[PDB]
Amino acid sequence: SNIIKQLEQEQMKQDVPSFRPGDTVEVKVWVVEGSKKRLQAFEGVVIAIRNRGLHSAFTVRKISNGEGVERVFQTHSPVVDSISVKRRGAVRKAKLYYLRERTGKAARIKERLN
Amino acid sequence: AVQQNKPTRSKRGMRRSHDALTAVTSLSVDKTSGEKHLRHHITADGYYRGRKVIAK
Amino acid sequence: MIGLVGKKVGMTRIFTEDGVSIPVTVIEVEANRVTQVKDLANDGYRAIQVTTGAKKANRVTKPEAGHFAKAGVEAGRGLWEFRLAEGEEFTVGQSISVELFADVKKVDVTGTSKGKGFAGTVKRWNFRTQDATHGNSLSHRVPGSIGQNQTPGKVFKGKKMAGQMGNERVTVQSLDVVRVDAERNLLLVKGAVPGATGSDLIVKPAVKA
Amino acid sequence: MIQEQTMLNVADNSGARRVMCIKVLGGSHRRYAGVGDIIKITIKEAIPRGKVKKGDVLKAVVVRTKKGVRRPDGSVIRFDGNACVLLNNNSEQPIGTRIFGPVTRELRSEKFMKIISLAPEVL
Amino acid sequence: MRHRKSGRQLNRNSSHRQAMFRNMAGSLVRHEIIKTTLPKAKELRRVVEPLITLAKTDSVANRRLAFARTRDNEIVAKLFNELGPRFASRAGGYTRILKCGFRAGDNAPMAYIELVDRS
RNA sequence: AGGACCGAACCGACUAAUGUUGAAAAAUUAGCGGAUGACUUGUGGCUGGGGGUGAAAGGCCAAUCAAACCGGGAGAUAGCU
RNA sequence: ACACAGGUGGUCAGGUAGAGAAUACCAAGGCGCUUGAGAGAACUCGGGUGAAGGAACUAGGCAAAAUGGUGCCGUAACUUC
RNA sequence: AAUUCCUUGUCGGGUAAGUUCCGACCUGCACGAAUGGCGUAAUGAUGGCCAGGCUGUCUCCACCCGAGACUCAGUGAAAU
RNA sequence: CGAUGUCGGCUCAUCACAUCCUGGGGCUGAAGUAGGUCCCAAGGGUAUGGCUGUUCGCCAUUUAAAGUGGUACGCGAGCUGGGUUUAGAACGUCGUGAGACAGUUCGGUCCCUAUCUGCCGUGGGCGCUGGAGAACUGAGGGGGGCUGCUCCUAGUACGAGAGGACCGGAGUGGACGCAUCACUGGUGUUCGGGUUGUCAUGCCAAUGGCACUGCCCGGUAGCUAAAUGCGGAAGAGAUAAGUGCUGAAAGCAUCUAAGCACGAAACUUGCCCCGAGAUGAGUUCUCCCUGACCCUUUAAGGGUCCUGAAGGAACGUUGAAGACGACGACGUUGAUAGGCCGGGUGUGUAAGCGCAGCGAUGCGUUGAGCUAACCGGUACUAAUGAACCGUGAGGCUUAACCU
Ligand SMILES: [Mg+2]
Ligand SMILES: [Mg+2]
Ligand SMILES: [Mg+2]
Ligand SMILES: [Mg+2]
Ligand SMILES: [Mg+2]
Ligand SMILES: [Mg+2]
Ligand SMILES: [Mg+2]
Ligand SMILES: [Mg+2]
Ligand SMILES: [Mg+2]
Ligand SMILES: [Mg+2]
Ligand SMILES: [Mg+2]
Ligand SMILES: [Mg+2]
Ligand SMILES: [Mg+2]
Ligand SMILES: [Mg+2]
Ligand SMILES: [Mg+2]
Ligand SMILES: [Mg+2]
Ligand SMILES: [Mg+2]
Ligand SMILES: [Mg+2]
Ligand SMILES: [Mg+2]
Ligand SMILES: [Mg+2]
Ligand SMILES: [Mg+2]
Ligand SMILES: [Mg+2]
Ligand SMILES: [Mg+2]
Ligand SMILES: [Mg+2]
Ligand SMILES: [Mg+2]
Ligand SMILES: [Mg+2]
Ligand SMILES: [Mg+2]
Ligand SMILES: [Mg+2]
Ligand SMILES: [Mg+2]
Ligand SMILES: [Mg+2]
Ligand SMILES: [Mg+2]
Ligand SMILES: [Mg+2]
Ligand SMILES: [Mg+2]
Ligand SMILES: [Mg+2]
Ligand SMILES: [Mg+2]
Ligand SMILES: [Mg+2]
Ligand SMILES: [Mg+2]
Ligand SMILES: [Mg+2]
Ligand SMILES: [Mg+2]
Ligand SMILES: [Mg+2]
Ligand SMILES: [Mg+2]
Ligand SMILES: [Mg+2]
Ligand SMILES: [Mg+2]
Ligand SMILES: [Mg+2]
Ligand SMILES: [Mg+2]
Ligand SMILES: [Mg+2]
Ligand SMILES: [Mg+2]
Ligand SMILES: [Mg+2]
Ligand SMILES: [Mg+2]
Ligand SMILES: [Mg+2]
Ligand SMILES: [Mg+2]
Ligand SMILES: [Mg+2]
Ligand SMILES: [Mg+2]
Ligand SMILES: [Mg+2]
Ligand SMILES: [Mg+2]
Ligand SMILES: [Mg+2]
Ligand SMILES: [Mg+2]
Ligand SMILES: [Mg+2]
Ligand SMILES: [Mg+2]
Ligand SMILES: [Mg+2]
Ligand SMILES: [Mg+2]
Ligand SMILES: [Mg+2]
Ligand SMILES: [Mg+2]
Ligand SMILES: [Mg+2]
Ligand SMILES: [Mg+2]
Ligand SMILES: [Mg+2]
Ligand SMILES: [Mg+2]
Ligand SMILES: [Mg+2]
Ligand SMILES: [Mg+2]
Ligand SMILES: [Mg+2]
Ligand SMILES: [Mg+2]
Ligand SMILES: [Mg+2]
Ligand SMILES: [Mg+2]
Ligand SMILES: [Mg+2]
Ligand SMILES: [Mg+2]
Ligand SMILES: [Mg+2]
Ligand SMILES: [Mg+2]
Ligand SMILES: [Mg+2]
Ligand SMILES: [Mg+2]
Ligand SMILES: [Mg+2]
Ligand SMILES: [Mg+2]
Ligand SMILES: [Mg+2]
Ligand SMILES: [Mg+2]
Ligand SMILES: [Mg+2]
Ligand SMILES: [Mg+2]
Ligand SMILES: [Mg+2]
Ligand SMILES: [Mg+2]
């Protein structure tokens, strides 16, 4: 509907970089602890992207301290302060859930050049 | 599972109270061929809303 | 205090700068415009009948058309009454905007919930299903026992059974008003309201508050 | 989203490798424990010389779930597995002195600030 | 329930529906008018008209798509050589449903579905 | 080599669901056992009712078995309904 | 008893894959099973998928799920070897 | 104990918890030596118990695909 | 006894109150905390497991609590079939034996398409006094009603300390319920792709069929819970036990006899839903119909002609409505459905061609191609001019007004 679309449009971010599944991204999120806002980085492989305008989201998978950690960011959330693409990854799928059963060398994804 | 008394012809008629058929309210007349037909259906000659729609 | 008749437009989120995503139902509230004012003398109670939206002239019948003409107002898509509180006055032709809710913090939203058709006891009443295995013969979602033996020798009224679920009037209470946008005729309330997209909604200032 | 019979990994160094939730605490008929929730556990697997022993019945705080936690913006943080920190039955203080793997902000509360401080990373 | 769902089951499985609608689309392209049950004609609109839309622009890829959807080379040929050009200016709605009573055998409500520019 | 192994045909029939006025007076479907043997199977034959036959369950002996069926004694008898 | 999902001995034995007469898809050949049309509720039947958990179900892991091939490496107690 | 009533004997193991299981004890109600005793590899659509894997068995059900059920047309039962 | 199917479990309950929790209160050998006991109170709530066929019980760990009972010790034309209670077999025991056992053990067919009552839903008829379209009122009915913890009050009152409140306020939970799909997910045999075997499209290439959707990987809409919103209340009235005031009988005393007050999750309301068949059939607003003559058994009579309204129905396109009816939208003066156009979404760089490579294949064209149910538009197709039903001013008697 036009009304809902306008409501979401006047709210969407205008600066979201173009990334793809298999890209390594650093997402800088706002962490409020105490009375002070700091900026915490979460870096990992984009294993899934949901494009729904304002309701767009993307899932980033990392291995921190031995444990596998997936985080679904709402792209247009003000909590997500920035997104940067560190590595540009070559995959053929839209959603890389097969990386959940992979570690180390098996979990490597090659870089798409050009 | 099964009846414990035989229901009456009265009860049977009261059940069949809703079994009546409804006549078609009114037939249309094709404006060209002039023959009756159901609303929104072609005539038996192959007419619908005037034009000949199927060759016989 | 009186409510308005809006339409359910859909659901979305409102991001707060603080970082919260508020799920909101968007309700378009076009100008509710009064048709009849009821009072103790003629009707025995105080209420305003309002209409909203528009209707095809070729589907506004002459009784409806004459009612609207007496009100001196354009035909809407329906007619809804709101009971008036003490010392609350409206004239026959007033248009009531969504601006009415500019102050109120919580509203009650009444709608017609989505109709689920004929629902089994599992869906309709949250009945526990019986064993899917372990010998169960043909009795996986059936309601089990429905009474007792020879005393009372009947099934009680109000027994939870299969039947029509939904497609009924449902009021959800104390929804927080997130935004009143009188310019675009929007009322954004936090959370879900009854009904499908594009269905009619009654929005009142919350009775409990 | 942890229930009875759920096996959790142990995010501390108390000695246990695997524990089983035998009770979700804090309410009648309570089904699941998320992150930050206290559960009763029995130790199923432990290292030979640790603070805790196999078959011990004690408490634990769930710190990572594979179901994940929602944040106010609608984001979710999931983990590859379920993990808890063993706690003393009475004090409900962690038994170990070291927290392994990341934890989350839902632990940021005076009950588990020691866990938060000892944790290597807090999502 | 069935809220906002599209496509008639027609008391068949999915593979049967797909095969039957291939046969019926081929019949309709071949004969330009067929008699079939009214629900099948309504469902056939959504199979046949996309084929004509596809055939309006002739390319090898569009020929091959039409051949995947119809599996009949002479049907593809008729589409792309006759009905594409015949319907080039028509913005959709290439077929017409004409209700024609009921079958004797089962009292099924019948209908003719024909190409609009047949007569 | 083998009363050997896995496994079709073939022979059986452990579990389950369905079916239970069945498609069927015992089956279907999914699994299941044996599958060169004390195997299975066709044709023909023999054993006859207090008798047969029985790797034995009172099993089976024409959908009938702690005494087959058919006819007869016979309208047994029935202090029972 | 039926134009009945049962039973009925023998012979023939194509292609591709396959160990195969398994199985899959086909050939020759033969069929679509003698009510259809719609709809797309509960519920029943037969199936598919399923977050997190994983036998907490239950009399019982019943049923499901799972395992599953070939080559090779490797293989415990016990043993009548 | 396919045997034990008392009895869920007692002790040990397994479990968080074990009337079942396993190992013992001997107080064998009422084992016992070819109506065999006690062992026993292998075997078993055999009984009991435990574990790994696996899972809608379950927490707790959801959706989907088909055959019915529902409506129309034709035929047209049954127990009672 | 020409059959009333047993235990337990499951499912689904319903009532009682001799109340387990929560609520109110008296006494206490009640300092506080925590108790003990009794009274009132049935609104709501009132464990999961291990063992066993169990009920029970014991145990483990919860909980505010894990109530007691009735309901054919509720519930097998609802399920199970472990126990029990057929036929097989064995052990102990008894018996010469056949066999047997308030012993044990292994195995062992649970039928019924609902006529009536009932109940859950959903329609058709007529009624409601001219007809019709709406909006109501609210007699009545139903739903709901649970509770933890933390913080503040306040380390205050109380207490020698140890400990540690009432009342009041705030927050956050569990269970339950309603709604919803924005999110997170599931599903998504109608979308995209990968891939095995095989057959076919003459062949290559590219596709299609079949193999559980062949096997998979994703996934739109819808539907969904595990997802996220909301709810239980506050308030009022009359009370329970109980506490009183004033106060005689009975010069005092006395909560009572007259009078007056307070008093609880119980009751009546307040919240939500149904609801005028509420036959006591209600109200309000609007709309429509303003013609002729015959008739005799003369009256709420029948007839014929003319007339056919408001509206309804029917039909069609249909719906986030639905078993069917119903209900909603729309029918050319039209976006109702399909198609079409644009977008979105999903999948993931089609085909063809070119280049590189011996080739598999890669690269480029190319985030390409395709894309359901979605969004925004678009009369291209289909929603027909009609016809049909429904009438023509609406009884009697009284009363009050109007002339
Ligand atoms: Mg009788
Ligand atoms: Mg009928
Ligand atoms: Mg519906
Ligand atoms: Mg259950
Ligand atoms: Mg059965
Ligand atoms: Mg079943
Ligand atoms: Mg649709
Ligand atoms: Mg059919
Ligand atoms: Mg297929
Ligand atoms: Mg052999
Ligand atoms: Mg045999
Ligand atoms: Mg078989
Ligand atoms: Mg074999
Ligand atoms: Mg004899
Ligand atoms: Mg015997
Ligand atoms: Mg026999
Ligand atoms: Mg004899
Ligand atoms: Mg004689
Ligand atoms: Mg006689
Ligand atoms: Mg036949
Ligand atoms: Mg046959
Ligand atoms: Mg072969
Ligand atoms: Mg074969
Ligand atoms: Mg047939
Ligand atoms: Mg179905
Ligand atoms: Mg499956
Ligand atoms: Mg799928
Ligand atoms: Mg699962
Ligand atoms: Mg998945
Ligand atoms: Mg999973
Ligand atoms: Mg168990
Ligand atoms: Mg249990
Ligand atoms: Mg099994
Ligand atoms: Mg299987
Ligand atoms: Mg003995
Ligand atoms: Mg004993
Ligand atoms: Mg013992
Ligand atoms: Mg013991
Ligand atoms: Mg166990
Ligand atoms: Mg057990
Ligand atoms: Mg022992
Ligand atoms: Mg002996
Ligand atoms: Mg001797
Ligand atoms: Mg002897
Ligand atoms: Mg022996
Ligand atoms: Mg019929
Ligand atoms: Mg008869
Ligand atoms: Mg009897
Ligand atoms: Mg009788
Ligand atoms: Mg009492
Ligand atoms: Mg007391
Ligand atoms: Mg009660
Ligand atoms: Mg009650
Ligand atoms: Mg009561
Ligand atoms: Mg009350
Ligand atoms: Mg009793
Ligand atoms: Mg009973
Ligand atoms: Mg009871
Ligand atoms: Mg019963
Ligand atoms: Mg029973
Ligand atoms: Mg009965
Ligand atoms: Mg039994
Ligand atoms: Mg016996
Ligand atoms: Mg009615
Ligand atoms: Mg009430
Ligand atoms: Mg959703
Ligand atoms: Mg959506
Ligand atoms: Mg979805
Ligand atoms: Mg090829
Ligand atoms: Mg193929
Ligand atoms: Mg073929
Ligand atoms: Mg085939
Ligand atoms: Mg999804
Ligand atoms: Mg109150
Ligand atoms: Mg009072
Ligand atoms: Mg005094
Ligand atoms: Mg006095
Ligand atoms: Mg309360
Ligand atoms: Mg359209
Ligand atoms: Mg227009
Ligand atoms: Mg895209
Ligand atoms: Mg290409
Ligand atoms: Mg392709
Ligand atoms: Mg590129
Ligand atoms: Mg794309
Ligand atoms: Mg498109
Ligand atoms: Mg549109």
SS3 E76: helix
Which residue spans within chain C are E strands per DSSP?
4-15, 21-28, 32-38, 47-51, 80-83, 95-96, 106-112, 117-119, 163-165, 169-181, 186-190, 200-205
Using CA coordinates, name the residue in chain D closest to C21: D73
Q: What is the span of the domain harbouring residue A88?
A: 1-113
Chains adjacent to E (≥3 CB pairs closer than 8 angstroms): B, C
> Which DSSP category does E82 fall into?
I
Give per-residue burial for C92-122: e unless 16+ CB within 10 Å, then b. eebebbbebbeebebbbbbbbbbeeeebbbb
Query: With 0-12 CB in 10 A as exposed, 13-18 as middle and 19+ as buried, what is C66?
Result: exposed
Mutation choice for D interface testing from C11, C14, C17, C20 by most D CBs within 10 A: C20
Cα dihedral sign for D31, D37, D41, D43? positive
> Which DSSP category does C113 fall into?
P
What is chain E's Cα-based Rg? 15
CA distance A89 to A61: 14
Indicate whether E6 belongs to any domain: no
| Both structure tokens of A83 | 């997104």
Solving technique for this entry?
A: cryo-EM
Residue A71: list chain D partners with CB under 8 A.
Answer: 75-78, 123
CA distance D64 to A66: 13
Using CA coordinates, name the residue in chain B closest to E117: B53
The CATH number linked to D63 is: 2.40.150.20
CA distance B40 to E112: 12
Q: Which residues pair with C13 in a beta bridge?
A: C23
Sequence-distant (6+) residues with CB within 8 A of C59 are: none
SS3 E44: helix
CB-based contact E13:E7 (threshold 8 Å): no
The CATH number linked to E98 is: 3.90.1030.10
Give per-residue burial for D42-70: e unless 16+ CB within 10 Å, then b. ebeebeeebbbeeebebbbbbbbbeebbe
CA distance D44 to D60: 14
Q: What is the span of the domain harbouring residue D80?
A: 1-123
Mutation choice for E interface testing from B48, B53, B56 by most E CBs within 10 A: B53
Q: Do D74 and C13 count as a contact with CB atoms less than 8 A apart?
A: yes
Cα dihedral sign for C116, C121, C125, C130? negative
Number of domains in chain E: 1
Helix (H) or strand (E) holding E39: helix E38-55
Q: Which residues surround ligand 9, an ion (CB under 5 A)?
A: E 15
Cα-to-centroid distance, D51 and ligand 13 (Å): 55
CA distance C110 to C66: 28
Task: Using a CB–CB cutoff of 8 Å, tell me whether A56 touches chain D.
Answer: no
CA distance D21 to E104: 68
Number of domains in chain D: 1
Which amino acid belongs to residue C50?
V
ω into residue C152 within 30 of 0, thus cis? Answer: yes
Q: Do chains D and E touch (3 or more CB pairs under 8 A)?
A: no
User: Which residues numbered 16-55 in chain C sit less than 7 A from strand F, measured from CB?
Assistant: none
Cα angle C30-C35-C40, degrees, rounded to a multiple of 5: 130
Which amino acid belongs to residue A44?
G
